[PDB]
């Protein structure tokens, strides 16, 4: 027996469809789940309106990790009352019968499940685009300095379509988030997304964010994740193929140059493709029918149109946080409409 009979033996609570909670919410069925617990849909009696309830697993690091996000959704909430930004909306929370719990506004799908749903050949780059230019609109909020948050956890998973329909969407998942300021987590990002300050132990900033967002716009139109490494090693060689040896200048104070790199002064790998010759421009097809060529004939993808994408691509692709595009300058940027 666990939790005097209404959890099972890996944290969560055992949903039961139909019971009734605090005189206020009827479950109705399990929607998502994943290491934090469980995503219901139920019914919210009290202000008449379906809602999902994220039901955080009863054990200790689990609460504290959900605690840590609770403060950061009340204090993005609060800051967008409106609800233009992009983020997911925190209606409230409680604990039952030792589960701490955040009710949200319901969703749809996520970015993986789109992806699969095409088979893996990717969307439109006319969805790839809206998606864009919400998803830097949403990294323009979290730079404000009242915020100043980095979400360190960024990539399909995380972002949610409003309705299957149609292409608004808002990000979720905010429990290994930090804000600017003391370094904390040293180590952070999942691996496909992990920026290259994060895999150097070099001093980092928001600017990881938008480093896994390029990661993540490629994938959405290729339909594969750009860098998929098995392990850190693997990960840095397969940014490598694409982008080229870093600039001497970050590898000279990078802590773990040496896990990858050795040292004319100048740098090359430890004993893949030869440095940058696996192309941007290839993998994108730029000048021979989109990805796989599956895009020839259509509308929606000219050559000048993939040219755009693959400037801005690179932008956010930059090896030095200190130039990497910003949120306020990729929304000027001429792939977007006016
Ligand atoms: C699944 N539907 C759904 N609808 C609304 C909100 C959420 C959600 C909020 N935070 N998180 N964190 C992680 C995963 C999902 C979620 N989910």
């Given at each position: 027996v666990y939790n005097d009979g209404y959890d099972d033996d890996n944290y969560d609570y055992i949903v039961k469809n139909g019971e009734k909670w605090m005189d206020r919410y009827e479950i109705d069925s399990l929607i998502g789940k994943g290491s934090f617990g469980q995503v219901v849909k139920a019914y919210d009696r009290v202000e008449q309106e379906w809602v999902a309830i994220k039901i955080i697993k009863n054990k200790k690091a689990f609460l504290n990790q959900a605690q840590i996000e609770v403060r950061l959704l009340e204090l993005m909430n609060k800051h967008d009352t409106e609800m233009k930004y992009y983020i997911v909306h925190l209606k409230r929370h409680f604990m039952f019968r030792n589960h701490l719990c955040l009710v949200f506004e319901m969703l749809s799908y996520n970015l993986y499940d789109l992806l699969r749903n095409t088979n893996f050949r990717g969307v439109s780059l006319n969805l790839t685009r809206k998606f864009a230019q919400q998803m830097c609109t949403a990294l323009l909020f979290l730079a404000t300095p009242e915020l100043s948050i980095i979400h360190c956890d960024l990539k399909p998973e995380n972002i949610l379509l409003?309705?299957?329909?149609?292409?608004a969407i808002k990000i979720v998942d905010f429990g290994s988030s930090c804000q600017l300021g003391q370094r904390i987590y040293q180590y952070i990002q999942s691996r496909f997304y992990r920026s290259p300050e994060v895999l150097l132990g070099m001093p980092y900033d928001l600017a990881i964010d938008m480093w896994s967002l390029g990661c993540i716009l490629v994938e959405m139109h290729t339909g594969e994740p750009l860098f998929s490494g098995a392990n850190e090693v693997d990960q840095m060689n397969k940014i490598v193929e694409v982008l080229g040896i870093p600039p001497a200048h970050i590898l000279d104070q990078a802590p773990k140059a040496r896990k990858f790199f050795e040292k004319d002064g100048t740098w090359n790998l430890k004993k893949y493709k030869p440095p940058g010759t696996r192309k941007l421009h290839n993998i994108l097809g730029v000048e021979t029918g989109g990805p796989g060529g599956r895009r020839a004939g259509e509308s929606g993808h000219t050559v000048a149109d993939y040219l755009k994408f693959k400037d801005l691509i690179l932008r956010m692709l930059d090896y030095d946080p200190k130039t990497r595009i910003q949120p306020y300058y990729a929304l000027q940027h001429s792939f977007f409409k006016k």
């Open positions: 409003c309705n299957p329909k149609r292409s």
